[PDB]
C-alpha cells in the first residue's frame, strides 16, 4: 500500500527526468552565442526617497509608473509621487511587523502584511479625506510573505504555513487554497494575463498554479537553497528565481526545464529580489552584498552593477513603461535609477 | 517655489506636514524599550508575561519607562526568515525552567528538555543578528526544584556533575553552564535571576538590567566605553 505508492512515485520522477532530458536537444547558451552583447549598462541615481525611520522591507509600483508604496518596520506604509519626491500618503499600521505590501492595479487600494498573519487592505479613495482599513483578511496560520492584487476584486497571498490563498475581498473569505509546498512560501509572481502564477518556497522549489482551478500545473527544481524571489518573463512563457546559493535561474514553462544559470565566482551572498526589464533582455537582482547586478538574460553576462546602498537590498521593482528601476534597502532609503 | 503651480505648492506643504508627523512619531517610538521574549515549551513564559495567532505584543509602564514585550512563541515557521526583524531590540528575555532537568520532550522521549533549552539558548546567543544584544535569563520555578533535587540528582541530565544534590550547588552549576554557552563574553551580557511563580521583584530586575544596558549603549555611542 504505502510502499506501492512510494515506488510508483519514484518511477514517475524517473519518467519526468527522462521526458525533460529527451527535449534537451541544445542549450540556450548554444543558441544565443552569436547575439551582439548588450554592452555595458550604466545607471545613475535620479531620486532618493527619505522619511522611513526603519528597515524597508517591501515596495511596489503603481500601474501609472509614477506612484510608489513602501513598507517599513517603523509601522509606516508610505505612498510616494516619486517625480517630485512628494509624499502622497503615510498610513500607520496596527502592527508594525510588516513584511509585504502591494498596490492595486486600479490605484484605489493598497495591501500589507507581516508577522501578524493578517492581510490588511486599505481604501485610498474615501470621502472623509483619510485612508482607512477596508478589510482584514485572517485565516493564515503563519506570517504573510507576499500578496498581489487581481483585477477581479480578488487577492493572492502566500504565507509561512506553506500554503497560498486566493481571497475574495468583498466577502472577506478564502475562495481558493493552494497546497503542495513542503516549506515556507517566500515569493509569488502573477502572469501577465492573471491566469497562472508562480510561487517559490524554502523547499528549493517553485510551482506553477492555476488561479482559477486551484491545482498545481508543474514544479521546477534546481536551486540548492531557499528561494527568496521569483519573477515572470514579460511574455509569460518563462520565469526567473533567486535563492540563497547566490544563483539566478531561468525556467521555461513549455519546455519544462531550466534554461540558464546566472552566477559568478566572487558572489557568495544570497539574492533577495529579481526583476526583468520591459523587453526582458536585462535581469536585475538584489543581493546581500549591498549591491544590485544587471545580467544579460540571454548571454548570462554581468551587464552592470548598481551601488550606493549601505545595507542589504530588500526590494526591487521596474515600472510598466520600463523607464526606471526602484530599489530599497535596510538603510531606510529608496533610490530610483535610469 | 518659483516653478511650481499653486496645487504643486500645496502638495509640497502636505508632504512637509507628513514629514513633521513622521518625525514626531519617530521621536515617540525611540523612547520605548523593546524586549524580545524567548523560551522553550512550558518554560514559565506565561508567568513572566503575567508579572509584567501570530506575534503577541504586551505593553506596560514602570517608573515612567515604557516597555514593549514581544512574544514570538506562537510561530511555527523557520526562524531564520523572520528573526532578523528583531535586530535592534534592547534585550532578549530568555525563560528556562529549573524543573525540566529530569524531563524529556513529548516528540522525542530520549531527548532531554533542558538540553533543547540550551540548544535554543546558544542558537540565540551566538547568532549574527544579536551580537551586541544583552540577554536577561529567568530561571523559573525554583520552588519546585529545591524539593525534587533530593530525589533526582543532576546526573540524570549532567552525568559529569560532581558535588552535592542540593539547591545551592545545582543552581550555580546550571547558571554557569548557561552563561558559559556564550562565546562573545566582552560584548554580550547575561543577567541571571532566580525567580518563582510567587515572586514580585521580576519587574524591578528587568528595569535594572534594561537601565544598565541603556547606560552601556550610551557610553559606547558617546565614545567613552
Amino acid at each position: 500500500e504505502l510502499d506501492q505508492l512510494r515506488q510508483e512515485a519514484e518511477q514517475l520522477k524517473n519518467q519526468i527526468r527522462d521526458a525533460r532530458k529527451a527535449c534537451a536537444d541544445a542549450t540556450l547558451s548554444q543558441i544565443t552565442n552569436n547575439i551582439d552583447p548588450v554592452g555595458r549598462i550604466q545607471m545613475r541615481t535620479r531620486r532618493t526617497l527619505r522619511g522611513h525611520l526603519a528597515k524597508i522591507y517591501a515596495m511596489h509600483w503603481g500601474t501609472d509608473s509614477r506612484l510608489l508604496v513602501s513598507a517599513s518596520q517603523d509601522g509606516k506604509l508610505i505612498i510616494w509621487d516619486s517625480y517630485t519626491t512628494n509624499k502622497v500618503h503615510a498610513i500607520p499600521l496596527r502592527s508594525s511587523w510588516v513584511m509585504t505590501c502591494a498596490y492595486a492595479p486600479s490605484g484605489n487600494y493598497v495591501a500589507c502584511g507581516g508577522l501578524d498573519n493578517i492581510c490588511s487592505i486599505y481604501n485610498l479613495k474615501t470621502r472623509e479625506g483619510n485612508v482607512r482599513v477596508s478589510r482584514e483578511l485572517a485565516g493564515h496560520t503563519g506570517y504573510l510573505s507576499c500578496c498581489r492584487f487581481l483585477d477581479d476584486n480578488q487577492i493572492v497571498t502566500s504565507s509561512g504555513d506553506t500554503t497560498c490563498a486566493l481571497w475574495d475581498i468583498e466577502t472577506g473569505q478564502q475562495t481558493t487554497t493552494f497546497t503542495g509546498h513542503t516549506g515556507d512560501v517566500m515569493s509569488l509572481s502573477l502572469a501577465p494575463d492573471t491566469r497562472l502564477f508562480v510561487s517559490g518556497a524554502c523547499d528549493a522549489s517553485a510551482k506553477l498554479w492555476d488561479v482559477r482551478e486551484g491545482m498545481c500545473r508543474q514544479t521546477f527544481t534546481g536551486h540548492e537553497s531557499d528561494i527568496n524571489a521569483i519573477c515572470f518573463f514579460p511574455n509569460g512563457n518563462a520565469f526567473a528565481t533567486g535563492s540563497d546559493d547566490a544563483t539566478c535561474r531561468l525556467f521555461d514553462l513549455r519546455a519544462d526545464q531550466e534554461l540558464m544559470t546566472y552566477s559568478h565566482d566572487n558572489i557568495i551572498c544570497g539574492i533577495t529580489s529579481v526583476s526583468f526589464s520591459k523587453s526582458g533582455r536585462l535581469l536585475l537582482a538584489g543581493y546581500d552584498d549591498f549591491n544590485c547586478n544587471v545580467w544579460d538574460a540571454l548571454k548570462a553576462d554581468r551587464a552592470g552593477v548598481l551601488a550606493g546602498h549601505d545595507n542589504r537590498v530588500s526590494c526591487l521593482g521596474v515600472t510598466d513603461d520600463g523607464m526606471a528601476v526602484a530599489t530599497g534597502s535596510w538603510d531606510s532609503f529608496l533610490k530610483i535609477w535610469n | 517655489g518659483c516653478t511650481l503651480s499653486a496645487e504643486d505648492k500645496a502638495a509640497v506643504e502636505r508632504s512637509k506636514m507628513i514629514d513633521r508627523n513622521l518625525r514626531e512619531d519617530g521621536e515617540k517610538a525611540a523612547r520605548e524599550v523593546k524586549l524580545l521574549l524567548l523560551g522553550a515549551g512550558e518554560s514559565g513564559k506565561s508567568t513572566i508575561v503575567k508579572q509584567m495567532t501570530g506575534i503577541v505584543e504586551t505593553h506596560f509602564t514602570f517608573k515612567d519607562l515604557h516597555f514593549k514585550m514581544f512574544d514570538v512563541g506562537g510561530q511555527r515557521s523557520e526562524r531564520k526568515k523572520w528573526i532578523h526583524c528583531f535586530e535592534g531590540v534592547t534585550a532578549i528575555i530568555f525563560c528556562v525552567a529549573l524543573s525540566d532537568y529530569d524531563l524529556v520532550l513529548a516528540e522525542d522521549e530520549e531527548m532531554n528538555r533542558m538540553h533543547e533549552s540550551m540548544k535554543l539558548f546558544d542558537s540565540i546567543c551566538n547568532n549574527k543578528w544579536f551580537t551586541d544584544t544583552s540577554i536577561i535569563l529567568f530561571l523559573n520555578k525554583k520552588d519546585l526544584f529545591e524539593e525534587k533535587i533530593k530525589k533526582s540528582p543532576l546526573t540524570i541530565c549532567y552525568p559529569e556533575y560532581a558535588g552535592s544534590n542540593t539547591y545551592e550547588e545545582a543552581a550555580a552549576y546550571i547558571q554557569c553552564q548557561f552563561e558559559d554557552l556564550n562565546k562573545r563574553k566582552d560584548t554580550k551580557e547575561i543577567y541571571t535571576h532566580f525567580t518563582c511563580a510567587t515572586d514580585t521583584k521580576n519587574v524591578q530586575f528587568v528595569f535594572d538590567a534594561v537601565t544598565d544596558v541603556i547606560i552601556k549603549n550610551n557610553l559606547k555611542d558617546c565614545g567613552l566605553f
Epitope: 509614477r66 512628494n86 | 503651480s5 496645487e7 502636505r14
Partner: single-chain antibody, 230 residues
Framework: VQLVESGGGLVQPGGSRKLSCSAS????????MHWVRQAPEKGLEWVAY????????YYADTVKGRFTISRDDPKNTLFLQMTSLRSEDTAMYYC??????????????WGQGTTLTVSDIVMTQATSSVPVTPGESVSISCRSS???????????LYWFLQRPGQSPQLLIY???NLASGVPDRFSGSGSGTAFTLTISRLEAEDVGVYYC?????????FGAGTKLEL
C-alpha cells in the same frame, strides 16, 4: 460630509461680524478651506483661503486688510472675521473644502451658505443663456485670457454647476476629469485658452448655471456663468 455656515444676518454699514462654519463627517484638519461668496448678481467671487496647516493664507484683493480667515481644528470650525463692512459685502457666503495631492479633487464639496446683508486671469463666457430641450446635447464654451497649461502637463480648469436653490457642485476638475458621483453624460475638452463642456443628453436635473474657474494662480477667478433654461 456636512458643512453648516452660521453667523449671518443684517449688519449696519461700517460694522463688524463673524461668520462660522461647522464641519462634520470628515477629517477637517486634513483639508484646506476656502470662503467663496455669491453676490445677488449671482456671480461667484473667491474671498479667502487657509491651508490645512494654517501656514498659507490668501485673500482676494477686494477684502485684503478687512477680512481675517482662521481655523480651530479641535472644534472643526472655520471662522471669518469681517470689519468695516460695506454695501458691496452683501452676499451668500459659501464655505468650501479643498485637499491638494497628486490626483485629488480640490473643490468637491461646498457648504450651504449663510446670508449676509449690509444696509488677473479673466474667464470669459460670451453666451449668458442657452435655450434647451430635454434629450439634446449642449456645448458650453469658456475662454481664458491666459493659457492655463502649465509646464508640468496639467491644465487647471474646473467646471461647476449650480442648480436653483442649491449650492454649486463640482463637475469636472483639471479640464478632463469627472468628479465622483457625476454621471458620464458630462465631458470636458479644450487646449490653451479654449475650453468646452459637452453634455450628450440633458435631463431635468441639468438645469442651472454653469461656471468655469481657473486654478493656475491666486486669486482664483470664476466665469460669468452660462444658464441653461428649459
Amino acid at each position: 460630509v456636512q458643512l453648516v455656515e452660521s453667523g449671518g444676518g443684517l449688519v449696519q454699514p461700517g460694522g463688524s461680524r463673524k461668520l462660522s462654519c461647522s464641519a462634520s463627517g470628515f477629517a477637517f484638519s486634513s483639508f484646506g478651506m476656502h470662503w467663496v461668496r455669491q453676490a445677488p448678481e449671482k456671480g461667484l467671487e473667491w474671498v479667502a483661503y487657509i491651508s490645512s496647516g494654517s501656514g498659507t493664507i490668501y485673500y482676494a484683493d477686494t477684502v485684503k486688510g478687512r477680512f481675517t480667515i482662521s481655523r480651530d481644528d479641535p472644534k472643526n470650525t472655520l471662522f471669518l472675521q469681517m470689519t468695516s463692512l460695506r454695501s458691496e459685502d452683501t452676499a451668500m457666503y459659501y464655505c468650501v473644502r479643498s485637499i491638494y495631492y497628486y490626483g485629488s479633487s480640490p473643490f468637491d464639496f461646498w457648504g450651504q451658505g449663510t446670508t449676509l446683508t449690509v444696509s488677473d486671469i479673466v474667464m470669459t463666457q460670451a453666451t449668458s443663456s442657452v435655450p434647451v430641450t430635454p434629450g439634446e446635447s449642449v456645448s458650453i464654451s469658456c475662454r481664458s485670457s491666459k493659457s492655463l497649461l502649465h509646464s508640468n502637463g496639467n491644465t487647471y480648469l474646473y467646471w461647476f454647476l449650480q442648480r436653483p436653490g442649491q449650492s454649486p457642485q463640482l463637475l469636472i476638475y483639471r479640464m478632463s476629469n469627472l468628479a465622483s458621483g457625476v454621471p458620464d453624460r458630462f465631458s470636458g475638452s479644450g487646449s490653451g485658452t479654449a475650453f468646452t463642456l459637452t453634455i450628450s443628453r440633458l435631463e431635468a436635473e441639468d438645469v442651472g448655471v454653469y461656471y468655469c474657474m481657473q486654478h493656475l494662480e491666486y486669486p482664483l477667478t470664476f466665469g460669468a456663468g452660462t444658464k441653461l433654461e428649459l
